């Protein structure tokens, strides 16, 4: 029986800083850092021993059962995911990115053509662009009514230039429940924006 835990895993830091992550374990720990869709790379093994061909900024603090991995002078290339690996159990990991780059989102609605309805399908999307932090609420409403369990939401990677984000909210509808209400709103509340914002659209 080997138990695993992690730091709150929702952490961010600025360039040229130092951050600490925590793992609780009762075995051998090997730190792995992983890019997006790439094979993870071994970083620190045995808690404190440092692997050959690794930047010297890393460190390992073996104290009791707690574990630390402090990175110095945070550089842009350090933006990745980190997790501690034991024999079998592997923790979900951590998410690391730049911080504080606040930007107000903007709901963007684009009514489609009638062409896809000829094929018996409707599809409209609510877009949330240029915002940070990620957490927010994006929903659809039919003449300002509840709508849930019918939209698929996707978020692009962290925006490289402005250190921002962008959220997409694609909605699928049937025939009758689409044109029954001409105008819809997509209200979004977010930390970046000062006050919650609602949108309107027309088809013509």
């Amino acid at each position: 029986d080997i138990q695993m835990t992690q730091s709150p895993s929702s952490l961010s830091a600025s360039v040229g800083d130092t951050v600490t992550i925590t793992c609780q374990a009762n075995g051998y720990l090997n730190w792995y850092q992983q890019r997006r869709g790439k094979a993870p790379k071994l970083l620190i093994y045995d808690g404190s021993k440092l692997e050959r061909g690794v930047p010297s900024r890393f460190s390992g603090r073996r104290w009791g059962q707690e574990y630390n991995l402090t990175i110095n002078n945070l550089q842009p290339e350090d933006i990745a995911t980190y997790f501690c690996q034991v024999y079998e159990f592997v923790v979900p990991g951590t998410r690391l990115d730049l911080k504080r780059t606040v930007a107000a989102p903007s709901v963007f609605i684009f009514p489609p053509s009638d062409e896809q309805l000829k094929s018996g399908t409707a599809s409209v999307v609510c877009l949330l662009n240029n915002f940070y932090p990620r957490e927010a609420k994006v929903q659809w409403k039919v003449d300002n009514a509840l709508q849930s369990g019918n939209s698929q939401e996707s978020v692009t990677e962290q925006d490289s230039k402005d250190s921002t984000y962008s959220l997409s909210s694609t909605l699928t509808l049937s025939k009758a429940d689409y044109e029954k209400h001409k105008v819809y709103a997509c209200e979004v509340t977010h930390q970046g924006l000062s006050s919650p914002v609602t949108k309107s659209f027309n088809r013509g």
Binding site: Q85, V86, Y87, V90, V125, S168
Partner: protein, 216 residues
């Protein structure tokens, strides 16, 4: 030097059999263990098993036992190997990348890692891409790449010339097994409604290009 490499992407139908390979030749491989790791998309890693090149002895967790199988095929000089898996009776939500790694010491540290092979399984078999326009009323503009399978598809605007503030959202898959992703580009506020753009895509698994002339 170690050049641990993994084969290319493979797609199979539900309930069928799939095979993914991995090779290692750049060191004394007759003595280090090999491990397989699979990672569900948007989720942490997951152990698959460990195989000994000495005897080919496999080992599996509880859930994957029976369904999975591990095998090695040595060369005559014991210098170049080729490790193969086989996941019989593929299930629905098992679409994940599969990693081959190497064990360095008794500390269970893995140094060398394979390239990784993308394996996806679903119904709604191979077909071309169809692109449905969005007509705008700063702003944006999207070319919804609907009803295509399987991944991936190239995306570009105006022969790739005009890519002002592109935002290609990752391909989210629906229940139907037909992939759909939204791609938008930053555009001015008052200038839209009169300008015309074009979206061009290519689906390598089906090898069909459709050019769409998006209009207000």
């Amino acid at each position: 030097q170690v050049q641990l490499l993994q084969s290319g992407a493979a797609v199979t139908k539900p309930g069928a059999s799939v095979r993914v390979s991995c090779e290692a030749s750049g060191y004394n491989i007759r003595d280090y263990f090999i491990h397989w790791w699979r990672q569900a998309p948007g989720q942490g890693l997951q152990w698959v098993g460990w195989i000994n090149p000495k005897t080919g002895q496999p080992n599996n967790p509880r859930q994957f036992q029976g369904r999975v199988s591990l095998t090695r095929h040595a060369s005559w000089d014991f210098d170049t190997y080729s490790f193969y898996m086989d996941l019989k009776a593929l299930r629905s939500d098992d679409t994940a990348v599969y990693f081959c790694a190497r064990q360095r010491s008794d500390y269970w540290d893995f140094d060398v890692w394979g390239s990784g092979t993308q394996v996806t399984v679903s119904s709604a078999s191979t077909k071309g891409p169809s692109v449905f326009p969005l007509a705008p009323s700063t702003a944006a503009l999207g070319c919804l790449v609907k009803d295509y399978f399987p991944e991936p598809v190239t995306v570009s605007w105006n022969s790739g010339a005009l890519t002002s503030g592109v935002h290609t959202f990752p391909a989210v898959l629906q229940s139907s097994g037909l992939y759909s992703l939204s791609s938008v580009v930053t555009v001015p506020s008052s200038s839209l409604g009169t300008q015309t753009y074009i979206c061009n895509v290519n689906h390598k698994p089906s090898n069909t290009k459709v050019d769409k002339k998006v209009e207000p």
